[PDB]
DNA sequence: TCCGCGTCAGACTCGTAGGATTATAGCATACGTGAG
DNA sequence: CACGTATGCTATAATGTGAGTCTGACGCGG
């Protein structure tokens, strides 16, 4: 692909495929022209050598270093890894109608609720929004809803407030030890850039607020809302699932 | 422990017989008549000639060992295209050959987008000018400095220089620790978001209910004219394929068909509003 | 350590005493960086069994 | 005795210990280590003279030909810093080498006298680095910070178990040179011992000897301690060393004369050893069966035929004894080799090396290093002298030398880089030594086996690269190419040298964007050490023991500074008074003490210099003017403390504060605080961004100008004197006669930089310290930098704290702040951030930067002007545009719809799209500056072209006010040399100052004077020309940009940020907080006096964090400010000056044994007042790390405040005027702004752009990426039930792209549904195993 | 049973930077497709 | 027929190579 630059970028499997079929061809070539055998024995080696590196390179002993002397990496090392495609884009991936910010207390909060930015609610809710004004024929289409959004029109908030009435938001502390690290909570959309936290679910998240940051998620579904209000509910999850304590307490 | 692919081709050459003049002469007559076992010896016994072009090759564009293979087919055109009438000895003939098809080779697979060779040699000139201007200006060549010393077009040195910028890996991290490659940060541009495609589908979705809310006559001559109900994108006077059959009646009807339609944007709340857009 | 911090804080460390506590604090903060690890890939083997 | 700056504003000083050394200049290591790499030395081998003598002379294969250095120069710098800096180009000086190309005859021997060729070649251009420290690298400013490695020499270690459960120490050897191969001496569990070259594969170490030409016995002589045995008649007799046996069992009956001294069988003690050796006993009669088993040392044979009747270190028996006799032999050399102390290591490798000569051990060695290729002779002689025995390849360095030779024990330091015989035979001997007990093993983590390279020596082998890359181009065009008409420059390439430096400068690990949020981060990121990096450690390397802290980093080290973090303990800020030996190691002041009593004589001793003598506490008490006050000091030795009499006494820390660094040293009560808190505090200090008003610290240490002064940032007065013009841009000051030059024009002008960019987008502001007509010294605050007070470093802003919990507000160390603190604008803070536009050139077509915009609303295009460029002064807001551009479209090939759109409006507007430079989304602020970079040849802009205008313009007005001012001041000396002996006053200013080239006197000493000024005066009319020459050509001048690109334009915009909840703050010791609410003043808790707090931070984030300096920081800010509220209420009332210097003088004078004396009095009434408006704001106290103020002093300091002893205030609630129903501390801490302002942190996705592979989306709030939801994160929503949470997460939020969109249409239609698909991520997984030539099917239902 | 081999090592965040590095010869015929 | 791209040939003799090291732990296989 071209970098903006002008510049193109491109996955090293080029390079080590490229590496196979100069090779291999040569090796036709060298066939073609009734080569001395010790010269046609070298270029089998060294076809061996490039599909070796093309399949697992660093295997077959010294790695074949590229560009900057890192070693090329290969089919294997895209699914291996830690990095892989397993641990990385397949038992976790990054997600849309997610967003962070600083944690701060909240508490005037009841415990199944957390402060909202309304800046931050306004974007992880906008096909809300936008389903809500053409509803109200308050928008004509997406496009005109879009740019009432962008404009930040004052009947956009009271619509904003009307979607997310009992609906609920999940809120992550990194690391998540153990499932109590996601919580689900009512929320209530605030003046201000940072999150509100109750603070007796603070004990769950590990959460201090000397900067933590918590993911907030939206659970789009109607499955996905009963799950969050019924299992993963910041009041229904009062004890913990290791010992028969409560963990959420005033402290 | 001999393990290594380049060892092993190395310790196989030095166990080859090196060759003289007059063996050279007696081998190159039967090898050029056609002899079998005259080419093969020539050749293994040349093989060192090519590893020692080879070993002044390297840290240019590819491996030890993929230079010596190229600059082995160099001294194989070498055998076949030998005058040993000439007095003129070999190894100074077969070092052109395997100096040329190296180089060639260097110039062709080394880079990743293929560079075409016309372009490598104006390159060539314009970096040793280059050189040349570095050594007496203390700062270095600019593009206009090299073209008023080649008498050629900016342009066309800018070009040449563009060329020269070489590749970057995608798979490579750059956050110094392998925190993020930087495929993670380029994004598919080809690819519209979810929310530029759901605005497609509902201007998609309103034309059909917009075309049938004009006149049957209107839409009839709007849509199959843009392509929009049709199959074909046609023109003012191609309408006339279908049953129109004209040139002004089709432009008057075009036309009428748009202007309905403005007030149909100006009433629910558009026009102005989505002329920004 | 054999020698163990006589003082306090609200005495106030001297020189010896606070540059002998550097050792035990540095290894707690380098204890946390480090067998979080160990501890994270306990968690991880433990999950995938179960 | 006080300077001018500080007769202003007096810090009171807690300190009690006179400090007899004065903080050096803080970035002294950066500076010294690159000015002698750039350095020009005839001699002394550093930096680029060492590198090309290293290299140089490069003489051809053939050896006809040879290139020979002669000398170097570096150009001066093409662009200034400030050029640089802005145009994004590497500030660096051209390098001019001077080379010989000298050629041989190759008929004549060695005839000299063919060809020399000599000329000036073009080899790269260094970055230099700037007067601070830092390098400026593509317009960036970056620190190289100096690294920490293993020292060269030999280093003796051991594996304590590790190998074979058996649990055998194995001792080895290691010499480490600078450059070249390593040699690895070892043992094995079978007491063999081993070489490694260069860490391969296991040789017998007795290989090694023999390739070095060692017979057989000559290797034993070395090792092995001769015994004798004569055969006397018949029976066998041995020549006695009394002690040998020593600690042995006796196997037989020892008699001696006739009289038996020891029992068979009994252990020899000491009475025996001392009875036989003063009995002088030098035959003992032995069985012939003792024998049995001892090492013959040298080859014995037969005389009589000449065969070997026994090969050198061969086990003797019965017979061979038998033969030896009957041979005609009666003496046998054996090998002494009794176990214990002199162990048979040697013998027994001998046994097991399969090599009889040199050239068998030679073809081994070679056979080592490269297997496969057979031996030749000449092939193994070249190879093995070529590892450690070449000049070229090999060099210990003189460090490698010293440390070696002194790890020998040795007389001799200086010595060859390369490897003698005799030192590989003293390691192994050592080696043995040690195996043997008479022997220690060196420490790794001794900071006396840690060395640091700063820049110089770091350069120099980047150099050293360049130089040898391009010796084998050199040397191979010499070979090839006719000598005569070829000369030196076509061989040279620069770009080989130039590309392993630029390499270094910018790709390396160790040079880093230079960390500016404020000056304390800035000096501290100056002298950071790093053990990572190439030649170094590793995160995977890197253990416990390495990071924990050492014994020596006693003065050399901080303790307390290091990155809590992956990095904890490889990176290590350099300790206050620390600095560099000679050879790099770290080395640390001590006061000698001779004859007890302790002189100001002061000796830097380095790491094991530091082991040998015993160093007193700087605590310790010294008796005015002589010895030690107490009997028993305590002092260290040997690495650790305890009581020492004051005779045995050798010397004494030199400062309180030489163990702790820069940055710790700036915490007030570090004393009362715990380590770990005290890190995170040094470290939060760096974070602290620099407010609108800088405060001062009330509560500080005295290290607070040191750092303000040193860092750079503030302009300081080299020459004094009196300031003749002072401007909100500019500081000019006339000179002093004493300090100025009768030479040039003594008046110095200091520019000062207004509101630029940092490198975090922060704000760097000068500002003017002193007044119009202020007298000045050397060393005086002119200017005060971004975070400074009048020459103090003020990181933030002290505030009335209160401890006590409000409403919930302050629950997890959460901040309650006083509206207050928002309107006093105190905590605003400026950025200033640079977006650049790019115009590029595309296979389509050239972009162009037109205000003419297709799809624009007027309001937008308003704030561009005629080019497409907005405004100066201009407010912009998100999405307003900056620099208009559209990228021309080639054959767009729109739909029906878009047709039908196109043709509604016929607003077609040309080929063209919109790619313009907007402001990013919710950043606002005001455009400050705007900068256009063309190309040459292209046609300038109309707003370029004003742009040079105004540049030019205000070049002249600058050069014109250089001349003049120049002029003025110069014809002022002419008039007053006149007046010396020709009285001409009114005489002399009628006529006019042009016409004086005329005017002189008599050929005295005074007319030569006046040849100097008048010489002086066309020098700088001349100077005026080609400096305006210079200004007008860089102004006009076109830039070489990137390939692609035709024009930049670079928009500056600074933007004000309001403190606000969810911005993080901190104090001095390490206690952190996020604001949660700004509290309206009526309801902050408010004083008997009506005054409200400021801030109100919780009790319980103290005794858990165990930093109790904030509390007596808190006590002593409130008595500091008790007694600036008195000096207050005394300027409100006027009053005496005679009653104010009272009560300063009994304030400054209070301490119990206060070190700082303050004899107010000499202080004239003006400097009083002037000093009592500045003291009103609050007196600033200092309390010296380790030497603070006492809870007595700051009691005493509060009563004469009038403030409470306990410094708890009976405080009123805001809210209910209702009293708080227990007394509550209240003071002031000085609280700082950290960089992470919720502004930035915040961030949010519903929807964006997609990865190119994984379809997954993009992370990074810059990449508008959706949060990761990690395997942690999912296994939440598996132990709950959530299995459509789940789902969601994985397919329609992330790869899922049919089902994406699907769902995306169906929330706007309200319908909630998902309707899921499969995840792109695994179709990709699947493609990648099958590429792997795995057959993965999907099997159907 | 001893010792080279090879597979392991927490979770999210942001801020980044560099395109750097390199040399190739010059010219005529041949091979192949596109414009007027 | 011009333009872009490629394969051709050069005759003093020359004919053998050439990075970074150091984690600590555990579990099989020769
Ligand atoms: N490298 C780190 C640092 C912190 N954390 C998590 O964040 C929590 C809070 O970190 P921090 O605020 O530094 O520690 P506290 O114990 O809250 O102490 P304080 O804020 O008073 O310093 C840790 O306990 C841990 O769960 C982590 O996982 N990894
Ligand atoms: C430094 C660091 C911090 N954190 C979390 C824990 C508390 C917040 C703020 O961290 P700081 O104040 O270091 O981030 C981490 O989770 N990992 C880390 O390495
Ligand atoms: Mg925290």
Redesign the pocket.
Known sequence: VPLDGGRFATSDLNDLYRRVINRNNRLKRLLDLAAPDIIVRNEKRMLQEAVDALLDNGRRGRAITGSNKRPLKSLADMIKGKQGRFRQNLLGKRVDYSGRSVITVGPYLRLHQCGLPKKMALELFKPFIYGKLELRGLATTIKAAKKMVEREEAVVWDILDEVIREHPVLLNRA?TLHRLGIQAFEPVLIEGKAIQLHPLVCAAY?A?F?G?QMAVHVPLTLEAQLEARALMMSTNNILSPANGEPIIVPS | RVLDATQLYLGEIGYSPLLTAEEEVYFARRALRGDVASRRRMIESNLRLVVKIARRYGNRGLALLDLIEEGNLGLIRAVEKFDPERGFRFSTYATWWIRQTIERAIMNQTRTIRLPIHIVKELNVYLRTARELSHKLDHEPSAEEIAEQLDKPVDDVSRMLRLNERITSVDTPLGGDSEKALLDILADEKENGPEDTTQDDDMKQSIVKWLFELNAKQREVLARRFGLLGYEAATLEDVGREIGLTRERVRQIQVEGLRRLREILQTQGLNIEALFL | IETPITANFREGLNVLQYFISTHGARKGLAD??LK?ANSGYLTRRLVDVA | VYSYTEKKRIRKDFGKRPQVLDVPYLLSIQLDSFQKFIEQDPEGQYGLEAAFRSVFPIQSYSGNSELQYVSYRLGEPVFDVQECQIRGVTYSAPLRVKLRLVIYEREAPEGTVKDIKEQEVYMGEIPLMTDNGTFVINGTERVIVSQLHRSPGVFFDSDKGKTHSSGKVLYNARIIPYRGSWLDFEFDPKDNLFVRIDRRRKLPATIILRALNYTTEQILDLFFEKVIFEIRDNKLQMELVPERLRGETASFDIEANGKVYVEKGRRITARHIRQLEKDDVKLIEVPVEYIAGKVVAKDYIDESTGELICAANMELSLDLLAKLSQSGHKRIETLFTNDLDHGPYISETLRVDPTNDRLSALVEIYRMMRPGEPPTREAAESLFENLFFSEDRYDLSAVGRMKFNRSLLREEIEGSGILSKDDIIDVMKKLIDIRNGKGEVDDIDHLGNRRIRSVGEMAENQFRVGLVRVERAVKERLSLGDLDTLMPQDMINAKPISAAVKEFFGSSQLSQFMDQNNPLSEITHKRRISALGPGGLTRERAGFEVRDVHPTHYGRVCPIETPEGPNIGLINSLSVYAQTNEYGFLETPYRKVTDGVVTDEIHYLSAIEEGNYVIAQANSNLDEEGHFVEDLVTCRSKGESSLFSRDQVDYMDVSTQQVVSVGASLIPFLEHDDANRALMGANMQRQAVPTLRADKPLVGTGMERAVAVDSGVTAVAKRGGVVQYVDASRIVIKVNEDEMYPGEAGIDIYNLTKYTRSNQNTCINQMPCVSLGEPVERGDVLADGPSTDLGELALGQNMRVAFMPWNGYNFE?SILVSERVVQEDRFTTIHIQELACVSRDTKLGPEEITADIPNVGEAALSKLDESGIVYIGAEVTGGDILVGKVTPKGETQLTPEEKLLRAIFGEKASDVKDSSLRVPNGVSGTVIDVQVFTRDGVEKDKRALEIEEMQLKQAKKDLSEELQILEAGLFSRIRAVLVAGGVEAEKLDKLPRDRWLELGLTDEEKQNQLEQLAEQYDELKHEFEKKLEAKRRKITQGDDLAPGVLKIVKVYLAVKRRIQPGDKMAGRHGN?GVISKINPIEDMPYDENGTPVDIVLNPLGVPS?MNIGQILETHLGMAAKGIGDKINAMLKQQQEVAKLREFIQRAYDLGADVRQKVDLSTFSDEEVMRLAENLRKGMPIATPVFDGAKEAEIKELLKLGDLPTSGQIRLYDGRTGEQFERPVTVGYMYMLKLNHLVDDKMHARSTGSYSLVTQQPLGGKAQFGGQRFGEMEVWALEAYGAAYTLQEMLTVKSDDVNGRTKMYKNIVDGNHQMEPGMPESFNVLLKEIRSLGINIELEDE
């Open positions: 690391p590990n201090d000397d933590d | 946390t960086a979080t | 160390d952190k964090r």
